[PDB]
């Protein structure tokens, strides 16, 4: 589940970066 | 009732988001992503289009990285639901915001594109259901409804 955890962490980071930019 | 209208709108937003993400990747091919079924005079095409535009700066930076992690994950018809559910649940475990909602759409787009590129045709409607059903049952549709619906995304 290492890959699952990494994708989810990336998605939360990218999502938070977008949210801050908006 | 409010959640169900948001769920119906989510199907349109996701299909529009997929159409426009794919078109901009083509103008920067998956034939399943070149159709845009919408209800008459829908605003959800505009919503999906704008969400594909406003996430472009981040997405263009990281598209290769995301594709690489998907290659490692090796999603198939047999495991895609399990993997989608686990990843989406983790994404929202610490909260919901509009950026994370867009990240979920992007995940559905990249998952659908990846499986198609690896030979799995006819799966776009499956991923659409995964997205809609996840949002309905994991309180995302409720969060969107409390902000006035998907039209609130046009202010972003």
Author numbering:
A (entry chain B): 80 to 101
B (entry chain A): 22 to 49, 56 to 183
Provide the authors' original text about this structure.
We determined the crystal structure of the non-covalent W(3)W(5) BID BH3:BAK complex, which reveals the largest opening seen in BH3:BAK complexes induced by W(3) displacement of Y89 side chain at the center of the activation groove of BAK. Strikingly, the buried electrostatic network that stabilizes helix α1 in this complex is re-established as in apo BAK, involving two hydrogen bonds between α1 R42 and α2 N86 and α3 D90, and two hydrogen bonds between α2 E46 and α5 R137 (electron density shown in Supplementary Fig. 9b). Our structure reveals a mechanism for BAK inactivation that differs from previous complexes of BAK inactivated by rationally-designed BIM-like BH3 ligands that directly glue helix α127. The W(3)W(5) BID BH3-BAK structure bolsters the mechanistic link between the BH3 ligand binding-induced helix α1 stabilization and destabilization, and inactivation and activation of BAK, respectively. The wide opening of the hydrophobic groove in W(3)W5 BID BH3-BAK complex offers a novel strategy of inactivating BAK by blocking the activation groove while stabilizing helix α1 through indirect contacts. A caveat to this strategy is that an inactivator may activate BAK if it falls off and BAK reverts to a transient intermediary state resembling the BH3-activated conformation with a destabilized helix α1 electrostatic network. In contrast, the cavities in activated BAK BH3-BAK and inactivated W(3)W(5) BID BH3-BAK complexes are more modest in size (64–70 Å3) whereas activated M(3)W(5) BID BH3-BAK complex exhibits no cavity at the activation groove.
Mitochondrial poration by pore-forming BCL-2 Effectors, BAK and BAX, initiates apoptosis. BAK is dormant in healthy cells. Its apo structure exhibits a stable globular conformation incapable of executing poration. Autoactivation is mechanistically similar to direct activation: binding of exposed BH3 of BAK or activators to the activation groove induces conformational changes in the electrostatic network at the bottom of this groove destabilizing helix α1 to initiate BAK unfolding.
